[PDB]
């Protein structure tokens, strides 16, 4: 009995299967993250990603920033997280513009791990990527706003 | 079989390992909400222009209207100017 | 660095990094358009000479100006 096996049975594809890679807990969790919802409209997945990340970025900017100890503007240091959402959204946009042309099909895999034919994720299309970028921007600005809306009754404001 | 000249995606491991392929767990009305509101940002060229000009003018605004209580560079020196080694 | 380390070391290292990127979830959603490789042999001679020279000039300039102007005399 051995825990490590080749990836999907093929020992000459360069990888391995471990509790870290192929595990029911891990496979379910990764499968239930927005990026891995291949049939969903990329705009909604971008909404979720942007909401989570934009919400996250507020913390370090406010607590570690230069105005951190001037509580009058230190709280308002969330503008910086907003600006980073802007810059990241630029990076996404030029990534898609550079990566996908107008009429090209998805570059995502069209097979499953078990060999059956799959429909490829539209995220890897020019239109799908543009939708994911718009969703990440909207959700990101929105998540920053939501985090900034809560200044109260938290052990680390 | 792991080698098939007919299907090389299977032969070369071109799979979606963690792709769910399940239907949307996002309920509608939420979906239509974000679909109608994030729609103007789904044109990548237009979004690029809106981000460069919007963020650029935003930056110009917070830079032009900054207060010396925030930036020492606007506050300027508040001390009597010192004297150089031999000169002013 | 660029003058003492030579290329093959970095090329093998970058191969391990390519493997790392392709086998990392969420990140392998992102693909490079240009294959990452180690800098060329000559290119490293140039890059290292440029760092050596920029550091040379900027170091001596800082010392020159600070040591003179600080005294102005």
């Amino acid at each position: 009995y051995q825990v490590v096996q080749p990836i999907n049975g093929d020992p000459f594809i360069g990888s391995l299967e471990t509790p870290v890679t192929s595990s029911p807990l891990v496979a379910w969790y990764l499968s239930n993250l927005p990026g891995y919802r291949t049939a969903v409209n990329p705009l909604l997945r971008g909404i979720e990603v942007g909401l989570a990340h934009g919400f996250l970025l507020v913390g370090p900017f406010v607590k570690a920033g230069p105005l951190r100890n001037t509580e009058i503007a230190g709280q308002a240091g969330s503008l910086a997280a907003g600006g980073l959402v802007v810059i990241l959204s630029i990076c996404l946009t030029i990534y898609g513009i550079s990566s996908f042309n107008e009429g090209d099909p998805s570059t995502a895999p069209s097979l499953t791990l078990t060999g059956r034919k799959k429909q490829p994720d539209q995220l890897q299309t020019a239109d799908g990527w543009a939708k994911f970028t718009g969703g990440f921007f909207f959700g990101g600005i929105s998540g920053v706003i939501w985090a900034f809306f809560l200044l109260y009754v938290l052990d680390l404001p | 079989v792991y080698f098939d000249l007919e299907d090389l995606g299977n032969t070369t491991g071109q799979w979606d390992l963690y792709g769910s392929d399940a239907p949307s767990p996002y309920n509608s009305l939420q979906s239509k909400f974000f679909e109608t509101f994030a729609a103007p940002f789904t044109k990548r060229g237009l979004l690029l222009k809106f981000l460069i000009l919007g963020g650029g003018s935003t930056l110009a605004y917070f830079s032009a209207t900054a207060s010396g209580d925030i930036l020492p560079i606007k506050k300027g020196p508040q001390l009597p100017p010192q004297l150089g080694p031999r000169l002013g | 660095m660029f003058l003492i380390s030579w290329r093959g070391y970095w090329q093998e290292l970058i191969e391990t990094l390519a493997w790392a990127h392709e086998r990392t979830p969420l990140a392998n959603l992102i693909r490079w358009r240009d294959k990452p490789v180690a800098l060329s042999i000559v290119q490293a001679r140039l890059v290292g000479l440029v760092h050596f020279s920029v550091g040379y000039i900027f170091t001596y300039a800082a010392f020159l100006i600070a040591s003179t102007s600080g005294k102005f005399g």
């Binding site: 030029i94 550079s98 | 460069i52 | -």
Partner: peptide
């Protein structure tokens, strides 16, 4: 006042635009 406009203009906006544009030109395929 003017430095508060042009220092971020050429130190932030101009490098972002130039880097993005050059990125596009450099990644283009004809």
């Amino acid at each position: 006042n003017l430095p508060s406009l042009f220092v971020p203009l050429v130190g932030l906006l101009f490098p972002a635009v130039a880097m993005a544009s050059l990125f596009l030109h450099v990644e283009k395929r004809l």
